[PDB]
Design a protein around this ligand. Sequence first.
Ligand SMILES: O=P(O)(O)O[C@H]1[C@@H](OP(=O)(O)O)[C@@H](OP(=O)(O)O)[C@@H](OP(=O)(O)O)[C@@H](OP(=O)(O)O)[C@@H]1OP(=O)(O)O
Lengths: 1085, 5
Amino acid sequence: MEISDKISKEEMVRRLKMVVKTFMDMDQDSEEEKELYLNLALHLASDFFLKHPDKDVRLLVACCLADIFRIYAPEAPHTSPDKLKDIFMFITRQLKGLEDTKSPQFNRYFYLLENIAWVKSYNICFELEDSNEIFTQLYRTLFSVINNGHNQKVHMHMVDLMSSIICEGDTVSQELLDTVLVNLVPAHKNLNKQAYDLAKALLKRTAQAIEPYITNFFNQVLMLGKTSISDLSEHVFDLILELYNIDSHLLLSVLPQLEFKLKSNDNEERLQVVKLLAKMFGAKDSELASQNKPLWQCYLGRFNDIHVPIRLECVKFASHCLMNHPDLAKDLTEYLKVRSHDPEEAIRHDVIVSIVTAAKKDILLVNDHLLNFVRERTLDKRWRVRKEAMMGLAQIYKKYALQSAAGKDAAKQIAWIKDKLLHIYYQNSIDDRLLVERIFAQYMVPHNLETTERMKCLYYLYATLDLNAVKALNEMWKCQNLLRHQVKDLLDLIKQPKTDASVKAIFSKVMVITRNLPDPGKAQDFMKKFTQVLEDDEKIRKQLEVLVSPTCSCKQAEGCVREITKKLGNPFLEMIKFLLERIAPVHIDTESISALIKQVNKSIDGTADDEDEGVPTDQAIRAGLELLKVLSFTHPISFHSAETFESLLACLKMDDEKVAEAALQIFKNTGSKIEEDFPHIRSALLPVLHHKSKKGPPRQAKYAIHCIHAIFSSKETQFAQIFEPLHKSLDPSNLEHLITPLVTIGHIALLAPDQFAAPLKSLVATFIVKDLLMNDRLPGKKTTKLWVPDEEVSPETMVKIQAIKMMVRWLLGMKNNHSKSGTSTLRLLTTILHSDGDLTEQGKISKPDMSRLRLAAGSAIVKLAQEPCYHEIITLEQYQLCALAINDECYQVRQVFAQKLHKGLSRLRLPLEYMAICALCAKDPVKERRAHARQCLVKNINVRREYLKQHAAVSEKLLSLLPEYVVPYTIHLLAHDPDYVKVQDIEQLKDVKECLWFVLEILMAKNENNSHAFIRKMVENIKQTKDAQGPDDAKMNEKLYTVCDVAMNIIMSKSTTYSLESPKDPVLPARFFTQPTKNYLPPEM
Amino acid sequence: KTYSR
Ligand SMILES: O=P(O)(O)O[C@H]1[C@@H](OP(=O)(O)O)[C@@H](OP(=O)(O)O)[C@@H](OP(=O)(O)O)[C@@H](OP(=O)(O)O)[C@@H]1OP(=O)(O)O
């Protein structure tokens, strides 16, 4: 019953440990026991206990004082404030013992904590003058003892204890508030997660009560700039983020303070608010946008900030928003649009990354507008940007189109990617074109796929591509083929004995290859290094020899690039990998072609795949044949296998004309060694070729004849068995049955000129000319129309046309005019044109048939003109009459005739005098005709310039390509035009002018290398010559000289660089002008 | 019974 300094230390403790129990068990109700123990309660607070050096005593006394507050509440016994302060500070010092969870006394310290927490004893200190020091020291203690050794009951009691002080207190000083917020600072949060969790629990529990002091904290430092208020002033933004996640209400009055800070003129401060709000808005569970719309709208406005880092931050933020907040995606579309056009490359680039990143997670997170933005960026001016957009669309295709990762309806949303990506191959940029190739190899038709799967993929892809897409893909095949050949040529040059000559040849080849590589400024120098390595390392040569061989499988190729890359193991090694991936076969080899033809075979008989693969079995078959036809030109050797030829044989006996027509064309292009390596195929093929060659159809008969010529060494005797029977069947009584025989004979006459020289010569002279072209057994119906579909043409006309094409092939076979046989045919074709198509002039022939005969004769001369030996024979008068076909009364005639000129000129096989004909298209009423004529001129003038740019010129071969040399021909052609009758007439000379201006406007558009000076020097020279078609004819030379002055008037009035010196003295055509004053214009011009 | 305000 007594505890004092008199008793032994042992007995005192013994008494205390009993006094703890009675105080613990006592009740607030027991007035009796309270009045009794009241004096002991007052005594236990004595300074003898509060400062007792024994740890166990202070603990026991602390527990007592706690219950003593519990029992006597709400009216404690200790009244002295100075004494009441000593107690609660003493208790706080004891709470330090909570830290050692392994001590045997811990549970007593826990009882102390549990008691003051339940009783809210510390609330007594609200009235004490030093309340803030007490509460601050309490908070620091609790946050410094909490560790991973404490269960949730400890955490809970500490929150209860600290919550009361805030909720039921008069105020919260900044100092006291800081003891809580400091635990949230990132540096502290990192080293002490326990104190951090405790602070969160506290702030959450007391959110309503503490909001004003938090609001006051931020308002002082953000708005009023007072940093001295707290040592946590630097961490405000870190704290606002932490606080928002604990409870939104904590920032009730802080969000308006952020909205104000967005309007700040301080770029760095404005940036930080945006960085912050990005995390707040962007977070997955966040709902700040719905809860505070004005802040959301005020935030989105920063997408248009002048400061680049703020824009960049908003753009990076968009990715997270798109992924985490689909419903907010619509508020971003307009801002992502304008930023895709940003002046800063970094912003344009990151708009793509954000849209793609969202798309790759789920395509439904991005709409059509956002993908269209990525599309628009493939045409960006910066390579790094369009590189990002193309790769983006590739990765999207591979997921949501190839693999259908989001269903079938989603794959139709992006059906445009495959086409658009391949259209990029038409770009001038070498970097772009080579990237399309990498994309095609990785993302569209993955190379790592097994052969059969890889061609199944390609087959259905090729069947669903745009028209320009498949064209791009064909051009890609062709370019690699050309490059592989250039490399094999280089290797062969290196293998030669090294002379000064081969050294130069090697440099030329190197220079050509580098034009097909990125960064030609470094490629030229890297290929110098490359040739050096090849001359030395024989083992690297071998590996490249294998990689470039036409029988290189895709497997071997992967091995070859491996070995070469190894033995060169830095920007140099990067360059060669570009070269190696271009030439290395990835898709097409011998086994692939076999798999692909088998895939088309399947499609023809059942297959069941076409329907579920999303393509009509019809167009899939047609595409597969076109694909094989294309690959037969680019990869012919790859068709050389037993499996492929066996598959092609079955295709050749299908009864489907389009399938058989394709198989024949493929055999023609790849069957060069069938007879040697596959004799059973050869013998199986013979009977079919003879059948098709005899019974048609025409198209297949043609291909059959060329197949025999290509494959069989015995082709001579083969042709005999075919020709002689077909030679007999030629009877004018049968018209319908003469089509196929005439076709077959024509191609035989082309491929076997000497073997059948005499029968053909007689055949043409008697049957074609006299018996067939001179009669009209079946007069076509009389009509007003000038043209009819192929169906409605009289079968006799169709035979005449085919008989004309036969004569041309008969001449192209001979390639000589020795026996004056070419003159005869050219004389005949001319009379057909001069008689408007009615060779007999009896009027029994139909008008549409006459049109098709004019077109046939006009087309014939143009084809013969492409053969040098017959070009010599074509007289000016014949050529001039042929030229007038470009202005035929019939639209179809002039259209197709023009198409034939374009084709002859595009292949650089038709002389420029035939390009001058296009000048007469200025007389064409039809807009479409004038457009095509100009199109023809532009394309033909350019390719002739680009060709001369690369290739070294030669005396006679240079005049043939220089576009400027069209002007003399154009001047001559117009001077002889039928409409130009009266020499000095105005309206006729207005016509001559617009014709000249039709070609000159295009020819002069470049204006480089003294083009204009060169032209005027030609025109000057013409005035010093004679018409050559009639040198003595004065009136004819007057007409020549005046057309020159009209031409001269155009040049003078449309340029300023004409008066310069000509680079070279122009040589006029000898057969248009003889070897070399005033103006011949009427003054009204 | 406890201390509250
Ligand atoms: O070489 P082919 O694949 O057999 O094509 C030829 C040829 O086309 P190309 O010479 O351009 O390759 C003819 O063109 P031309 O030389 O006569 O200008 C063309 O003539 P048409 O324009 O009158 O149709 C023709 O028809 P033909 O069967 O009489 O040779 C036939 O093309 P297709 O057989 O593929 O239709």
